[PDB]
Structure formats: structure tokens, C-alpha cells
Amino acid sequence: SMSLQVNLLNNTFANPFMNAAGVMCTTTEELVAMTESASGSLVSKSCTPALREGNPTPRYQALPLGSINSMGLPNNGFDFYLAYAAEQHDYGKKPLFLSMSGLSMRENVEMCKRLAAVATEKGVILELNLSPQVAYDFDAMRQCLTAVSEVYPHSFGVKMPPYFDFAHFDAAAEILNEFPKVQFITCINSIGNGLVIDAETESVVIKPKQGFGGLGGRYVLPTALANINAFYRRCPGKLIFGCGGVYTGEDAFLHVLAGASMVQVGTALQEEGPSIFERLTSELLGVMAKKRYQTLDEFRGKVRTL
Amino acid sequence: SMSLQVNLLNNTFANPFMNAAGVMCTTTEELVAMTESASGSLVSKSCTPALREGNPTPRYQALPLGSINSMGLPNNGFDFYLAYAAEQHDYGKKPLFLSMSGLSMRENVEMCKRLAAVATEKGVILELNLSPQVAYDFDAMRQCLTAVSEVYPHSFGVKMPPYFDFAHFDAAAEILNEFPKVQFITCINSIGNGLVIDAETESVVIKPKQGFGGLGGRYVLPTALANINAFYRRCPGKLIFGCGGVYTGEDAFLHVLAGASMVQVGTALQEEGPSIFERLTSELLGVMAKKRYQTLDEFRGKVRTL
Ligand SMILES: Cc1cc2nc3c(=O)[nH]c(=O)nc-3n(C[C@H](O)[C@H](O)[C@H](O)COP(=O)(O)O)c2cc1C
Ligand SMILES: Cc1cc2nc3c(=O)[nH]c(=O)nc-3n(C[C@H](O)[C@H](O)[C@H](O)COP(=O)(O)O)c2cc1C
Ligand SMILES: N#Cc1cc(N)ccc1-n1cccc1
């Protein structure tokens, strides 16, 4: 008698699983397939105010241990994802997150002012993408969060890049803790600017930025658990969404042990498509069955230190 | 008619391979074993002015995809490694790097004052460990290198943690490029403060710092290549030492494509012992034979962008 059920942000989620922002969530067909999937939720592609073409191809490469990408925010623009949230999305099936990646504070303000009414009306939840990248610039981070908090009369979350230093966990957590409207932290975005070299071609594998791109998949699992756990501990008044290196229910289990409420799936979803959510719910239930857990609350954040 | 020979810092190296600082280079036995190995060179364990016990165990865990550690600078102290470099090391066999990780600017300044004479007399080469950690504080990094440059009348190199952002590559490169005595950059130290969770024990796998520790091995290879290439490009006046994710000659080949002169082996050496260097020399020669390269200079830094 087990349940993957999650209750947060005045919503019920059948399971903690959702796509990672920007994976299989750009087009109507992708958002519909995510909505029809076994996923507990979905998040729309990180949007700019206008349509963006993104970087030249190739800009994504599947790898044995995950993925490298420099997509360059290809998206249909805010209007498209706002309209999806306002008129098309079936909130009867599952809650919707809208990922926002304004290229300036002003763009985030303009989009948030217009998102306010649809959040109110329909219950779309903002994931503000902060992932120098804004979240690595504590002043730019504070300023963006101050602007969005000022103009957006709703709770939201922040998609954070990974940190690698306790001083940075502390500085990030201190800023996030100043903003009670930031009710979730998504840990993590890509491990930034890896470089994959193909030994056969003696070349990089993506065209933008000399082959440098965000790492996802198996590469990032320990970094993701560390950031999930770091912010779980440092932001006790906030929810942590896990993102990074989820291929299996066991990986999801580790996310939840580390403190994750929701568990986002990028690279694994990119490679397998939305049917992955049936497998992941099945596998996570299987993990909980072997371990005699009935709810996620029984082990969330209960990772044992030595 | 192939050579792995490297020529840098008034020295000849049989091959680019050496231990990563802190791997099998703490004790006399380890330094002798590394000197008797097929390695082109060796670096002594990062030393403090005095002996350090390091962190409570377990503080290292081998993983399928590499290693997590929080060693906490367990080292025999500066005197012991200066002594090794002054009186014991067979410079006949191969050149020697001394890794220094003073817990302050003052500690590094005092050690370098004393290292100066042994560098002159015996030719030991300083690898200054800068891996918030000093290398993530651009002002503190500049201050450390200013203080060490003042009192150390020698070429040395700096062990860098990975950066994840072009603004950080640029900021770091700009600072390193002010110090002509910094003639090599070792990219990279561990991917910092990962968190491994054992799904069976529902626990972390290392005792210190609530399970948080530096990632090495297969986790870090693209980050390593990125940092090697990033500094290779931004610091053309300097040599790059590659460190991170080297298990094979093919991995070393990738390090050298990215711009690495010397290639340091950490996790793989830890798991295999110093015999790895026979396999790595053989495997790199093999890769070079299949690709029709006779010297490292022929493909070093020549990774093709799209
Ligand atoms: C093709 C692709 C596109 C992505 N687009 C976005 C994006 O629009 N917004 C965002 O916040 N993260 C984006 N990411 C990062 C993912 O949300 C996720 O943080 C990262 O891939 C790590 O999770 P994974 O290990 O499951 O891939 C993208 C990743 C990939 C691979
Ligand atoms: C047990 C262990 C001890 C280490 N000690 C040091 C150290 O003293 N100084 C240092 O600069 N890096 C140290 N490191 C980092 C390694 O030198 C190396 O940068 C890192 O392991 C990545 O290389 P790898 O992927 O080959 O392991 C240590 C790593 C390990 C696993
Ligand atoms: N955050 C931050 C940060 C800040 C400085 N000033 C430098 C490096 C940073 N960093 C390291 C790993 C990833 C980001």
C-alpha cells in the first residue's frame, strides 16, 4: 500500500516526476505528450519574451555518461507558453510549471507582470531560471529575485546552477532565504561548460562556443544530490526540486533521500521520451517496496551522515 | 618512431604522465614507488607548514564512475617534502613537483621562502594548490600569487579547481596572466563538494562534511578537458597540466588534444597503483600509432571546433 503522492504549492502531484525545463517541453505536441505522460507534473521550455532560434547545430550530443548541450534557449517565446498555461493546459491531469529565462531583469519583470494574472486564474507555477550566469553573480541573483518578488504577487521557484563550495551554498541560501515567495529551489541545471572531445574525430561534438556545453546525465548525479542536500539543509523553509542524473527510480530515491520533493528528468527523458515516467514511477515504487516505505515523506531528506 | 617526450621548465620528461597531487605521494615509500614507476614525473602530497592528520575516515570512496574524497590535507608537513626534494629524490630518474597547500597566504609565503633554495640547488618545481577556496575568490587568488611571486624567485605552477563559466575562465586567466612566474596551470582539482548517497545504506559514503567531497575519475573528464582547453586558449604564455578522468591513453590523448603538456592521474592511479603508468605510456603510444602521430607537439591543443 504505497504512494508517490506529493502535496506542495497548494497542489497534489500523483508522483514527484516531471521533465527538466527545456527537455521535451518546447512545442504544443511536447507539452501535450508531457501532460498525457505518467509524470506528476511538467515544466515548459525556459522562455524569452520573443521566439528564439537558439544556437547553430549540432548543439546537443547524447554521451555514454549523459549529455552535453549549448541549446542557446530555442523557445517559442513567452506568449506561446503563457497561452498554453492560460487556455490549453489540462490542470485536471497535473499541475504546470512555466520556466522563465529572461536575458535581463527587465525581461523577467515584463514577463512576470503578465504571468501574474494567469498564475492567479489557472495556477501555473513560475520556475525562474537563474542558470557570468546570474546565480554565480550573487549581486545579479539578489537583484533579479528582488525585481521578480516586487512585481510577481505569487510564490515561485528558482532553477539553480550547481555550486561546488560551501561558501557559495551559504551565499546562495542566504539570498534565497531573504525571499519568502521563493518556495522551491530546483537543484540543478547542467554542470556548466564541460568540453566533450571525440577521440576518433579529434573534434568537439557541438558547434556553439568552441564545443563547451552544459553536462547532464550520469556526470551530474553526485553534484545534483550535493546541491539538493546543501539547499535542503540551508533553506529549511523551502522545497527542493531535484534535477540531475535521474535514469532510474533508485536515482529518484537518492534525490528524495537528499531532500527532493519533485524529481526532474532531462537527459534520460531526452533519450527515452515520455514513456520513461511509467518506468520511473514503477521503479521508485519497487525501490520503496524492497525498503518497506509507503510514502516519500518517510525518507525525504533522511540521508544518514556518518 | 614515436616519443611521449615533453620539454618544459628547463627539464626533459620521458612521458607526460604523473600522479595527481595527493594520490600515492604522501610517504617516502609512495614517493620512491612513484620515482621507480614508468611515470614521466611525480608531485608530492599537498603540504602544510606542519604535519596534518586529515579528516576522520572513511574520507575516500572508489565509485563505478570515479571517486569522492574529503582527505583534509593529511600530509607529513613541508619540512618532510622539502627534505625529500633536497636530499632523497633521484632527479636522475625524473623531475619532481612539490605541491604546497598553505592554509593562508602567510603559510605559503613562509614555505616558498624556504623552498627557493632547494628549487635553485635541486630543480624541484612548485605546484601551488589554490583549490571559498582561493581560486574561486579572484581578489584573494591575485593576492596569494602577488605574495608568493614576491618571495619565490622561480617558475612555479598553480593547481586550479574547475570553473563552469566563461566569465570565470576569463577572470581566472586574466589574474594568472599577470604572474609570469606562473608558467603552468594544473586543470583540474576535484569537482568540489559532490555528495554520494549509497541507495542500500540510505547514507553518505564519507564521514567528513556530512558526506560532501571532491569528485574524481570518469565524472570529471569533460570538466577537465573544458578547463584545460579554456586555460590553454586564454593563457598562451603558459603550459597546461591536465588532471581529471584519465584511465586510458585515449583519455590522455584527449587531455593533450585539449592542450595538456603533462597529464596527471588521480583516481585511476589510486585504484591501480603505480604500474598504471606502464599501461598509460603503452596505450597513448598505441593511440598515436593508430592516428599516425610521432610526437605530442603534433596534436597538443589542436582539438577541432565545428
Ligand atoms: C536539451 C536540453 C535543454 C535544456 N533546457 C533547459 C532550459 O530551457 N531551462 C533550464 O532551466 N534547464 C535546461 N536544461 C537543463 C535541464 O533542465 C537539467 O537541469 C539538466 O539537463 C540536468 O538534468 P539531467 O541530468 O536529468 O539532464 C536543459 C538540458 C538539456 C539537455
Ligand atoms: C585521495 C586524493 C587526494 C588528493 N589530494 C590532493 C592534494 O593533496 N592536492 C591537490 O592539489 N589535489 C589533490 N587531489 C585531487 C587530485 O589531485 C586530482 O586533481 C583529482 O582527483 C582529479 O583527478 P582524477 O580524475 O584523476 O582523480 C586529491 C584527490 C584524491 C582522490
Ligand atoms: N557561485 C560562484 C562562484 C563565484 C566566484 N566568484 C567564482 C567562482 C564561482 N563558482 C565556482 C564554481 C561555480 C561557480
XYZ file of C-alpha atoms and ligand atoms in Angstrom:
688
model
C 0.000 0.000 0.000
C 2.369 2.758 -1.309
C 2.049 6.312 -2.738
C 4.400 8.539 -4.816
C 1.860 11.330 -3.987
C 3.430 14.775 -3.280
C 1.481 17.774 -1.841
C 3.146 21.209 -2.228
C 2.404 24.742 -3.545
C -1.357 24.160 -2.841
C -1.254 21.298 -5.404
C -1.403 17.469 -5.434
C 1.070 15.582 -7.681
C 0.366 11.868 -8.451
C 4.187 11.346 -8.333
C 7.276 13.602 -7.907
C 8.459 13.104 -11.551
C 8.475 15.868 -14.202
C 10.610 16.836 -17.225
C 13.679 19.065 -16.670
C 12.975 22.573 -18.094
C 13.879 22.593 -21.839
C 13.664 18.777 -22.287
C 10.667 17.681 -24.453
C 8.624 20.782 -23.495
C 9.174 23.353 -26.339
C 6.250 22.666 -28.789
C 2.466 22.180 -28.200
C 2.931 18.459 -29.108
C 5.755 18.141 -26.485
C 3.709 19.886 -23.715
C 0.652 17.682 -24.597
C 2.788 14.457 -24.561
C 4.249 15.536 -21.170
C 0.632 16.241 -19.942
C -0.536 12.778 -21.287
C 2.598 11.101 -19.686
C 2.605 9.312 -16.274
C 4.660 12.345 -14.981
C 3.342 14.027 -11.801
C 3.974 17.427 -13.463
C 5.687 19.186 -16.396
C 7.579 22.465 -16.935
C 7.523 24.453 -20.234
C 10.790 25.339 -22.092
C 12.612 28.310 -20.437
C 11.077 31.256 -22.373
C 12.364 34.669 -23.550
C 9.792 37.441 -24.306
C 10.121 36.654 -28.083
C 10.694 33.439 -30.120
C 14.417 32.403 -30.102
C 16.089 30.217 -32.795
C 18.847 29.089 -30.361
C 22.463 28.221 -31.293
C 23.623 26.512 -34.526
C 23.548 22.646 -34.723
C 24.886 20.364 -33.509
C 24.038 21.860 -30.066
C 23.104 18.597 -28.229
C 25.072 15.285 -28.073
C 23.928 12.156 -26.148
C 27.005 10.580 -24.443
C 27.595 7.193 -22.732
C 27.590 9.022 -19.291
C 24.933 11.634 -20.183
C 24.708 14.673 -22.482
C 26.418 17.945 -23.443
C 24.322 20.829 -24.886
C 24.622 24.506 -25.825
C 20.977 24.888 -26.987
C 21.015 28.744 -26.638
C 17.376 28.941 -25.317
C 15.489 27.893 -28.506
C 11.848 28.596 -27.444
C 8.513 29.787 -28.962
C 8.516 32.932 -26.734
C 6.645 33.842 -23.509
C 3.284 34.489 -25.319
C 3.231 30.851 -26.580
C 3.921 29.315 -23.092
C 1.599 31.879 -21.375
C -1.208 30.973 -23.884
C -0.505 27.242 -23.222
C -0.823 27.920 -19.432
C -3.919 30.200 -19.853
C -6.108 28.268 -22.383
C -4.681 24.814 -23.456
C -3.147 23.036 -20.384
C -5.424 20.455 -18.662
C -4.844 21.248 -14.930
C -7.288 18.323 -14.313
C -4.419 15.941 -15.343
C -1.471 17.612 -13.490
C -0.021 20.967 -12.336
C 2.022 23.046 -14.847
C 5.316 24.888 -14.178
C 6.365 27.674 -16.599
C 10.176 28.115 -16.839
C 11.162 31.757 -17.431
C 14.674 32.679 -18.662
C 14.583 36.425 -19.428
C 18.014 37.635 -20.736
C 17.619 40.744 -18.491
C 15.935 41.656 -15.153
C 13.626 43.961 -17.266
C 12.527 40.970 -19.484
C 11.771 38.864 -16.325
C 9.794 41.855 -14.842
C 7.812 42.362 -18.127
C 7.002 38.587 -18.414
C 6.218 38.197 -14.647
C 3.803 41.221 -14.717
C 1.853 39.382 -17.497
C 2.226 35.871 -15.886
C 0.668 37.187 -12.571
C -2.949 37.047 -13.899
C -2.591 33.503 -15.410
C -0.943 32.170 -12.184
C -3.939 33.668 -10.225
C -6.581 32.341 -12.733
C -5.157 28.909 -13.786
C -2.458 28.029 -11.150
C 0.613 27.822 -13.473
C 3.721 27.964 -11.167
C 6.788 30.035 -12.196
C 10.219 28.328 -12.186
C 12.580 31.319 -12.646
C 15.773 30.076 -14.430
C 18.891 31.786 -12.885
C 21.223 29.214 -14.644
C 28.559 35.197 -15.517
C 25.284 33.170 -15.222
C 23.025 35.146 -12.811
C 23.168 32.584 -9.920
C 27.044 32.690 -9.961
C 26.801 36.515 -9.521
C 25.260 36.881 -6.015
C 24.514 40.613 -6.674
C 22.781 39.858 -10.049
C 20.923 36.956 -8.311
C 19.719 39.211 -5.443
C 18.677 41.945 -7.951
C 16.695 39.528 -10.249
C 14.937 37.953 -7.203
C 14.215 41.467 -5.761
C 12.669 42.603 -9.121
C 10.560 39.404 -9.598
C 9.467 39.435 -5.868
C 8.418 43.120 -6.272
C 6.219 42.663 -9.411
C 5.092 38.953 -9.164
C 2.328 38.637 -6.498
C 2.827 34.823 -6.253
C 5.127 32.089 -4.895
C 7.697 30.755 -7.414
C 10.875 28.677 -7.524
C 14.387 29.173 -8.911
C 16.326 26.793 -11.176
C 19.841 26.971 -9.700
C 23.138 26.010 -11.314
C 25.348 23.685 -9.228
C 27.699 25.172 -6.602
C 30.967 23.406 -5.630
C 31.907 25.379 -2.469
C 30.210 25.648 0.996
C 30.842 29.461 0.906
C 28.714 29.521 -2.313
C 25.956 27.279 -0.830
C 25.864 29.715 2.165
C 25.835 32.893 -0.041
C 23.114 31.436 -2.371
C 20.997 30.091 0.570
C 21.319 33.486 2.419
C 19.948 35.355 -0.657
C 17.153 32.798 -1.393
C 16.152 32.857 2.349
C 15.529 36.668 2.083
C 12.642 35.922 -0.412
C 9.648 34.090 1.125
C 7.954 33.970 -2.383
C 10.822 31.598 -3.438
C 9.090 28.453 -2.071
C 11.105 25.954 -4.175
C 14.728 25.652 -5.384
C 15.386 23.344 -8.390
C 18.882 21.786 -7.977
C 20.424 21.546 -10.534
C 20.856 22.976 -14.016
C 23.670 21.495 -16.171
C 27.234 21.326 -14.822
C 28.281 24.364 -16.935
C 30.747 24.437 -19.836
C 32.087 20.898 -19.939
C 34.024 20.052 -23.151
C 33.491 16.669 -24.858
C 36.265 15.693 -27.323
C 35.606 12.794 -29.742
C 38.927 10.843 -29.800
C 38.050 9.454 -33.310
C 37.363 12.887 -34.969
C 39.848 14.774 -32.654
C 36.992 17.336 -32.517
C 34.407 18.749 -30.116
C 30.854 17.363 -30.653
C 28.812 20.632 -30.507
C 29.228 23.747 -32.697
C 28.469 26.684 -30.313
C 31.159 28.185 -28.014
C 34.115 26.017 -29.267
C 32.370 22.759 -28.102
C 31.705 23.938 -24.493
C 28.262 22.998 -23.162
C 26.247 22.058 -20.075
C 26.714 18.468 -18.853
C 23.676 16.376 -17.823
C 23.036 12.696 -17.015
C 25.323 10.315 -15.011
C 28.086 13.017 -14.919
C 25.982 15.246 -12.614
C 24.229 12.884 -10.130
C 26.598 13.442 -7.122
C 26.753 17.246 -7.853
C 22.905 17.259 -8.008
C 22.469 15.305 -4.715
C 25.033 17.696 -3.071
C 23.111 20.807 -4.235
C 19.694 19.261 -3.383
C 21.029 18.360 0.100
C 23.020 21.616 0.590
C 19.870 23.778 -0.053
C 17.518 21.286 1.711
C 19.677 21.889 4.850
C 20.313 25.650 4.300
C 16.744 26.588 3.125
C 14.591 24.722 5.705
C 11.507 26.918 4.897
C 11.660 25.972 1.168
C 11.020 22.914 -1.048
C 13.914 21.425 -3.089
C 13.171 20.013 -6.578
C 15.881 17.559 -7.652
C 17.225 17.702 -11.213
C 20.345 15.870 -12.480
C 21.329 12.289 -13.366
C 17.889 10.613 -12.926
C 17.702 7.482 -15.152
C 16.082 5.091 -12.602
C 13.699 5.036 -9.628
C 16.821 4.330 -7.491
C 18.337 7.681 -8.744
C 14.982 9.369 -7.904
C 15.154 7.627 -4.470
C 18.599 9.232 -3.901
C 17.147 12.670 -4.902
C 14.354 12.222 -2.296
C 16.820 10.939 0.399
C 18.851 14.160 -0.320
C 15.636 16.259 0.266
C 13.923 16.444 -3.187
C 10.102 16.964 -3.264
C 9.823 16.792 -7.112
C 12.353 14.932 -9.315
C 13.056 16.432 -12.768
C 14.348 14.263 -15.664
C 16.394 15.869 -18.507
C 18.927 13.707 -20.415
C 17.208 10.347 -19.565
C 13.878 11.804 -20.829
C 15.609 13.294 -23.931
C 16.901 9.754 -24.834
C 13.813 7.644 -23.883
C 10.828 10.016 -24.408
C 7.851 10.499 -22.050
C 7.200 6.715 -21.539
C 10.170 6.971 -19.062
C 7.698 8.329 -16.411
C 5.786 4.948 -16.354
C 9.146 3.154 -15.795
C 10.353 5.702 -13.164
C 7.092 5.543 -11.070
C 7.194 1.701 -11.354
C 10.929 1.610 -10.388
C 10.588 4.132 -7.463
C 7.567 2.154 -6.110
C 9.724 -1.029 -6.493
C 12.591 0.643 -4.530
C 10.119 1.723 -1.770
C 8.628 -1.864 -1.702
C 12.087 -3.544 -1.158
C 12.760 -0.919 1.617
C 9.243 -1.054 3.189
C 8.468 2.691 2.575
C 4.803 3.622 1.885
C 5.172 7.440 1.316
C 8.003 9.763 0.099
C 7.697 11.715 3.450
C 9.115 8.631 5.320
C 12.633 9.085 3.771
C 12.677 12.571 2.127
C 15.860 14.328 3.374
C 16.634 11.405 5.777
C 20.054 10.633 4.145
C 22.189 9.279 7.040
C 25.572 11.052 7.621
C 28.424 9.177 9.418
C 59.493 6.267 -34.466
C 57.273 7.830 -31.716
C 58.103 9.773 -28.493
C 55.984 10.717 -25.419
C 58.902 13.098 -24.535
C 57.864 16.526 -23.132
C 60.229 19.543 -22.797
C 59.162 22.285 -20.315
C 60.691 24.308 -17.416
C 64.374 23.508 -18.312
C 63.570 19.726 -17.908
C 63.106 16.590 -20.081
C 60.194 14.221 -19.246
C 60.168 10.665 -20.744
C 56.322 10.942 -20.952
C 53.633 13.433 -19.802
C 52.186 11.127 -17.074
C 52.457 11.872 -13.332
C 50.362 11.233 -10.181
C 47.730 13.877 -9.321
C 48.885 15.728 -6.141
C 47.660 13.774 -3.082
C 47.443 10.353 -4.818
C 50.159 7.856 -3.647
C 52.668 10.686 -2.895
C 52.346 11.234 0.908
C 55.024 8.811 2.315
C 58.706 8.111 1.466
C 57.626 4.639 0.136
C 54.993 6.304 -2.162
C 57.431 8.985 -3.470
C 60.103 6.260 -4.121
C 57.444 3.988 -5.797
C 56.316 6.981 -7.989
C 60.033 7.696 -8.812
C 60.584 3.955 -9.730
C 57.268 3.952 -11.762
C 57.244 4.468 -15.599
C 55.718 7.955 -14.870
C 57.385 10.941 -16.609
C 57.206 12.809 -13.263
C 55.638 12.874 -9.777
C 54.214 15.524 -7.406
C 54.489 15.288 -3.578
C 51.276 15.393 -1.433
C 49.988 18.985 -0.929
C 51.955 20.057 2.195
C 51.055 22.377 5.121
C 53.867 24.052 7.146
C 53.330 21.322 9.819
C 52.141 17.657 9.771
C 48.293 17.241 9.449
C 46.253 14.112 10.474
C 43.494 14.948 7.925
C 39.725 14.277 8.313
C 38.120 11.249 10.055
C 37.657 8.056 7.930
C 36.091 6.978 5.778
C 37.310 10.049 3.788
C 37.743 8.348 0.344
C 35.307 6.078 -1.582
C 36.000 4.468 -5.006
C 32.846 4.669 -7.210
C 31.918 2.938 -10.502
C 32.374 6.392 -12.220
C 35.387 7.576 -10.148
C 35.919 8.683 -6.528
C 34.618 11.028 -3.794
C 37.095 12.190 -1.085
C 37.423 14.627 1.844
C 41.043 13.751 2.813
C 41.542 17.139 4.620
C 45.269 17.526 3.620
C 46.705 14.552 5.606
C 50.438 15.274 4.907
C 53.826 14.818 6.676
C 54.380 18.628 6.542
C 56.561 20.971 4.429
C 59.917 20.031 6.136
C 59.411 16.328 5.179
C 58.685 17.057 1.426
C 61.416 19.776 1.282
C 63.806 17.117 2.782
C 62.671 14.576 0.099
C 63.296 17.196 -2.653
C 66.623 18.440 -1.078
C 68.387 15.126 -0.161
C 66.461 11.928 -1.246
C 64.764 12.393 -4.671
C 66.692 10.876 -7.660
C 66.429 13.795 -10.182
C 68.427 11.340 -12.364
C 65.225 9.209 -12.747
C 62.714 12.107 -13.335
C 61.825 15.706 -12.365
C 59.882 16.271 -9.110
C 56.987 18.655 -8.341
C 56.304 19.689 -4.717
C 52.606 20.506 -4.075
C 52.070 23.287 -1.461
C 48.618 23.969 0.111
C 49.256 26.553 2.861
C 46.041 27.288 4.847
C 46.878 31.032 4.463
C 48.950 33.443 2.285
C 51.472 33.782 5.232
C 51.918 29.933 5.434
C 52.602 29.773 1.615
C 54.938 32.848 1.782
C 56.965 31.198 4.654
C 57.199 27.782 2.860
C 58.201 29.375 -0.527
C 60.973 31.486 1.180
C 62.432 28.104 2.338
C 61.580 26.232 -0.948
C 63.515 28.885 -3.016
C 66.992 27.421 -2.120
C 66.022 23.755 -2.880
C 64.387 24.812 -6.222
C 67.725 26.540 -7.214
C 70.004 23.700 -5.937
C 67.926 20.567 -6.864
C 65.364 21.788 -9.502
C 62.165 20.734 -7.564
C 59.178 22.573 -9.180
C 56.396 24.167 -7.070
C 52.772 23.255 -7.791
C 50.892 25.816 -5.615
C 47.429 24.412 -4.666
C 44.800 27.264 -4.971
C 41.945 24.649 -4.875
C 35.654 29.991 -0.506
C 38.702 28.116 -1.953
C 41.240 30.790 -3.036
C 40.778 30.162 -6.827
C 37.003 30.978 -6.545
C 37.897 34.355 -4.921
C 39.592 36.295 -7.778
C 40.935 39.101 -5.423
C 42.294 36.505 -2.905
C 43.862 34.500 -5.803
C 45.656 37.669 -7.116
C 46.789 38.453 -3.510
C 48.156 34.870 -2.948
C 50.109 34.932 -6.271
C 51.394 38.512 -5.537
C 52.643 37.371 -2.055
C 54.198 34.086 -3.414
C 55.713 35.892 -6.517
C 57.362 38.465 -4.110
C 59.409 35.823 -2.166
C 59.810 32.896 -4.658
C 62.378 33.748 -7.403
C 61.306 30.720 -9.545
C 58.923 29.414 -12.195
C 56.019 27.611 -10.462
C 52.547 26.366 -11.425
C 49.076 26.581 -9.846
C 46.606 23.718 -9.226
C 43.156 25.145 -10.183
C 39.686 23.894 -9.238
C 37.342 23.603 -12.238
C 35.432 26.683 -13.436
C 31.992 26.307 -15.062
C 31.538 29.773 -16.633
C 33.416 31.687 -19.421
C 33.356 34.865 -17.215
C 35.241 32.754 -14.588
C 37.632 31.260 -17.209
C 38.338 34.918 -18.261
C 38.640 36.299 -14.683
C 40.997 33.436 -13.646
C 43.073 33.640 -16.898
C 43.410 37.479 -16.551
C 44.813 37.035 -12.978
C 47.132 34.083 -13.838
C 48.393 36.114 -16.894
C 49.677 38.893 -14.506
C 52.209 36.400 -12.958
C 54.943 35.360 -15.436
C 56.413 33.023 -12.724
C 53.140 31.010 -13.112
C 54.438 29.002 -16.129
C 51.901 26.121 -15.746
C 48.229 25.720 -14.729
C 47.094 22.271 -13.491
C 43.430 21.822 -14.566
C 41.728 20.415 -12.571
C 41.370 19.658 -8.872
C 38.306 17.580 -7.844
C 34.811 18.702 -8.905
C 34.180 20.158 -5.436
C 31.649 19.042 -2.833
C 29.798 16.283 -4.646
C 27.555 14.101 -2.448
C 27.462 10.309 -2.982
C 24.450 8.528 -1.388
C 24.509 4.692 -1.143
C 20.923 3.614 -2.052
C 21.286 0.379 0.066
C 22.559 2.028 3.335
C 20.500 5.247 2.614
C 23.650 7.048 3.804
C 26.556 9.121 2.552
C 29.819 7.163 1.980
C 32.350 9.557 3.644
C 32.364 10.844 7.246
C 33.685 14.437 6.988
C 31.489 17.397 5.908
C 28.203 15.348 6.016
C 29.329 13.149 3.054
C 30.322 16.080 0.760
C 33.643 15.554 -1.042
C 35.634 16.174 -4.220
C 34.662 14.064 -7.263
C 37.389 12.493 -9.444
C 37.564 9.922 -12.258
C 35.039 9.499 -15.077
C 32.729 12.183 -13.519
C 35.234 14.986 -14.170
C 36.705 14.280 -17.642
C 34.626 16.767 -19.730
C 35.040 19.430 -16.963
C 38.796 18.723 -17.015
C 39.016 18.981 -20.853
C 36.960 22.231 -20.661
C 39.305 23.783 -18.073
C 42.470 22.506 -19.860
C 41.224 23.956 -23.194
C 39.836 27.142 -21.545
C 43.244 27.988 -19.944
C 45.193 26.625 -22.977
C 43.328 29.281 -25.084
C 43.357 32.172 -22.534
C 46.960 31.663 -21.238
C 49.098 31.148 -24.375
C 52.214 32.199 -22.352
C 51.736 29.162 -20.068
C 51.706 25.361 -20.176
C 48.570 23.455 -19.081
C 48.873 20.282 -16.967
C 45.767 18.128 -17.404
C 44.241 16.385 -14.381
C 40.825 14.658 -14.192
C 39.262 11.426 -15.513
C 42.413 9.836 -17.048
C 42.109 5.998 -17.043
C 43.490 5.247 -20.559
C 45.942 6.517 -23.198
C 42.803 7.623 -25.092
C 41.846 9.833 -22.062
C 45.444 11.231 -22.012
C 45.196 11.792 -25.824
C 42.021 13.884 -25.144
C 43.898 15.824 -22.380
C 46.714 16.579 -24.903
C 44.246 17.487 -27.759
C 42.703 19.969 -25.244
C 46.204 21.500 -24.721
C 47.760 19.451 -21.841
C 51.594 19.210 -21.731
C 51.711 16.880 -18.662
C 48.811 14.538 -17.741
C 48.142 13.814 -14.034
C 46.364 10.570 -12.988
C 44.456 10.614 -9.659
C 41.541 8.200 -9.055
C 42.816 5.679 -11.677
C 46.304 5.594 -10.005
C 44.630 5.249 -6.544
C 42.711 2.134 -7.789
C 45.550 0.552 -9.884
C 48.827 1.635 -8.189
C 51.937 2.996 -9.972
C 52.007 0.145 -12.602
C 49.216 2.173 -14.386
C 51.995 4.373 -15.914
C 53.366 1.385 -17.980
C 49.807 0.777 -19.333
C 49.185 4.548 -19.955
C 52.526 5.106 -21.852
C 51.792 1.931 -23.917
C 48.112 2.931 -24.573
C 48.982 6.581 -25.523
C 51.758 5.352 -27.938
C 49.110 2.927 -29.350
C 46.552 5.757 -29.894
C 49.346 7.844 -31.525
C 50.359 4.842 -33.765
C 46.684 4.352 -34.980
C 46.420 8.166 -35.652
C 49.933 8.486 -37.221
C 51.299 10.967 -34.615
C 55.018 10.708 -33.684
C 55.136 13.498 -31.010
C 52.679 15.147 -28.550
C 53.501 18.630 -30.079
C 51.857 17.329 -33.329
C 48.289 17.304 -31.807
C 48.642 19.185 -28.447
C 45.923 21.904 -28.291
C 44.744 21.005 -31.858
C 41.213 19.854 -30.858
C 38.981 20.801 -33.859
C 35.965 23.110 -33.165
C 32.901 22.969 -35.508
C 18.441 19.796 -24.377
C 18.418 20.441 -23.017
C 17.780 21.647 -22.849
C 17.707 22.268 -21.588
N 16.988 23.425 -21.474
C 16.874 23.948 -20.277
C 16.082 25.095 -20.114
O 15.431 25.577 -21.032
N 15.932 25.585 -18.842
C 16.585 25.051 -17.773
O 16.402 25.589 -16.677
N 17.391 23.983 -17.894
C 17.505 23.435 -19.086
N 18.278 22.310 -19.251
C 18.891 21.693 -18.069
C 17.977 20.621 -17.502
O 16.773 21.194 -17.022
C 18.658 19.903 -16.343
O 18.878 20.876 -15.320
C 19.974 19.227 -16.730
O 19.844 18.637 -18.031
C 20.403 18.193 -15.711
O 19.409 17.138 -15.604
P 19.709 15.723 -16.319
O 20.981 15.214 -15.656
O 18.482 14.877 -15.995
O 19.888 16.031 -17.799
C 18.351 21.670 -20.487
C 19.067 20.477 -20.684
C 19.088 19.845 -21.903
C 19.842 18.548 -22.043
C 42.837 10.775 -2.319
C 43.002 12.075 -3.062
C 43.809 13.056 -2.530
C 44.024 14.271 -3.204
N 44.910 15.171 -2.666
C 45.157 16.257 -3.355
C 46.124 17.161 -2.889
O 46.796 16.958 -1.893
N 46.406 18.246 -3.677
C 45.735 18.505 -4.831
O 46.034 19.539 -5.446
N 44.757 17.704 -5.267
C 44.503 16.610 -4.587
N 43.542 15.733 -5.047
C 42.902 15.994 -6.342
C 43.650 15.247 -7.431
O 44.966 15.714 -7.478
C 43.005 15.446 -8.796
O 43.070 16.837 -9.089
C 41.566 14.920 -8.850
O 41.499 13.650 -8.197
C 41.050 14.752 -10.258
O 41.883 13.777 -10.953
P 41.312 12.294 -11.211
O 40.028 12.443 -12.014
O 42.431 11.613 -11.957
O 41.071 11.705 -9.815
C 43.327 14.518 -4.408
C 42.430 13.554 -4.899
C 42.276 12.340 -4.268
C 41.336 11.324 -4.864
N 28.952 30.725 -7.359
C 30.033 31.007 -7.611
C 31.368 31.437 -7.926
C 31.756 32.727 -7.564
C 33.038 33.183 -7.856
N 33.422 34.457 -7.509
C 33.920 32.329 -8.517
C 33.549 31.051 -8.880
C 32.274 30.594 -8.593
N 31.901 29.266 -8.959
C 32.673 28.151 -8.763
C 32.001 27.077 -9.244
C 30.784 27.540 -9.772
C 30.742 28.883 -9.585
